[PDB]
Ligand binder design. Structure first.
Ligand SMILES: CCCCCCCC/C=C\CCCCCCCC(=O)O[C@H](COC(=O)CCCCCCCCCCCCCCCCC)COP(=O)(O)O[C@@H]1[C@H](O)[C@H](O)[C@@H](O)[C@H](O)[C@H]1O
Length: 307
């Protein structure tokens, strides 16, 4: 399989329960877990990395893990997640046209990696005008975009970043920029945030590495109290709402040369004219780290900036 073309064991610093560092009990739990799924006639997504993510999410409770994995497969099938990339490719022209319009309003882009080799992801929310946004897209569509990215992450970003890092990468480093949002709108989209949380928590376990929230308005901490109800404790412990010293905290986790200038780093697009909201820069663009999976498609069509 493709798995033989990139590291399947995490770095030596990874906590037990991860690929390459299991206790005897865990390693035994994993074999039993796979056996049960194999008996249920499951074929795909049964590799160590995937299975350990579900096991970790359920603290290695085999039956709870089986139940979680079964429901995930169910959803993947009904949601169309197993063919989300293919279907997008067959509709690229139309979908790209609408995505281009949404990107400028709601920047979503990866820009290199963090110090551990994790794909570095950025989102900027301050330019969103809900009214204008609801005229060009729907929450439904934004969720499907999210799901598609989850698939692109596992398909293209992980193999490449793992080959570069020298070890298996299973998570991302996210920076949520809230500069310019109204605490009021934060409350207003609680519903969508819940939907995002449901899909991620339930179908994409152990995919969060580091998650920073910067430039949040005063009072945000209170609004966040309403988000925590639908986030597992493990997830909440990965979320960090930074203050005025955010650049210094980001510099502790991300190479200065990989962090955009406005966030405290020195990274600049090769062509200062290009926009980060049409960019997709990282190891998965480096021919040296792209494998049999091929190169990731261009989500922003012709405007896609890969440098
Ligand atoms: C309409 C625009 C709204 C965009 C507002 C959208 C904001 C969302 C922003 C970005 C999208 C998030 C992408 C997340 C990338 C990380 C990968 C990922 O999916 O991680 C997953 C995390 O799932 C999530 O919860 C994702 C949702 C994150 C919510 C972040 C809080 C949002 C902050 C709100 C800001 C306010 C918005 C301002 C509004 C202004 C707009 C005018 C898996 O977690 P992990 O710890 O890896 O494993 C879990 C496992 O899974 C559980 O089962 C187990 O029980 C548990 O023990 C663990 O094993």
């Amino acid at each position: 399989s493709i798995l033989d073309t990139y590291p399947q064991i995490c770095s030596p610093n990874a906590l037990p329960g991860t690929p390459g560092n299991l206790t005897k009990e865990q390693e035994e739990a994993l074999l039993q877990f796979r056996s049960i799924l194999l008996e249920k006639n499951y074929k795909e997504r049964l590799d160590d990395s995937t299975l350990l993510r579900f096991l970790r999410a359920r603290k290695f409770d085999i039956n709870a893990s089986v139940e979680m994995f079964v429901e995930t497969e169910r959803w993947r099938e009904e949601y169309g997640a197993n063919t989300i990339i293919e279907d997008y490719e067959n509709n690229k022209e139309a979908e790209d046209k609408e995505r281009i319009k949404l990107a400028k309003m709601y920047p979503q882009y990866y820009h290199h990696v963090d110090k551990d080799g994790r794909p570095l992801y950025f989102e900027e929310l301050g330019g969103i005008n809900l009214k204008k946004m609801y005229k060009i897209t729907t929450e439904k569509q934004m969720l499907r975009n999210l799901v598609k990215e989850y698939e692109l992450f596992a398909t293209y970003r992980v193999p490449a970043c793992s080959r570069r890092a020298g070890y298996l990468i299973e998570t991302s480093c996210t920076v949520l920029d809230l500069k310019g949002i109204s605490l009021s709108n934060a409350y207003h989209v609680l519903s969508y945030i819940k939907d995002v949380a449901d899909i991620s928590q339930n179908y994409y376990p152990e995919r969060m590495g580091k998650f920073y929230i910067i430039h949040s308005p005063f009072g945000f901490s209170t609004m966040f109290k309403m988000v925590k109800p639908f986030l597992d404790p493990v997830t909440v412990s990965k979320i960090f709402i930074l203050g005025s010293s955010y650049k210094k905290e980001l510099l502790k986790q991300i190479p200065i040369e990989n962090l955009p200038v406005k966030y405290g780093g020195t990274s600049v697009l090769h062509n200062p004219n290009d926009k980060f909201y049409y960019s997709d820069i990282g190891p998965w663009r480096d021919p040296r780290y792209i494998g049999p999976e091929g190169e990731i498609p261009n989500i922003f069509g012709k405007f896609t900036v890969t440098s």
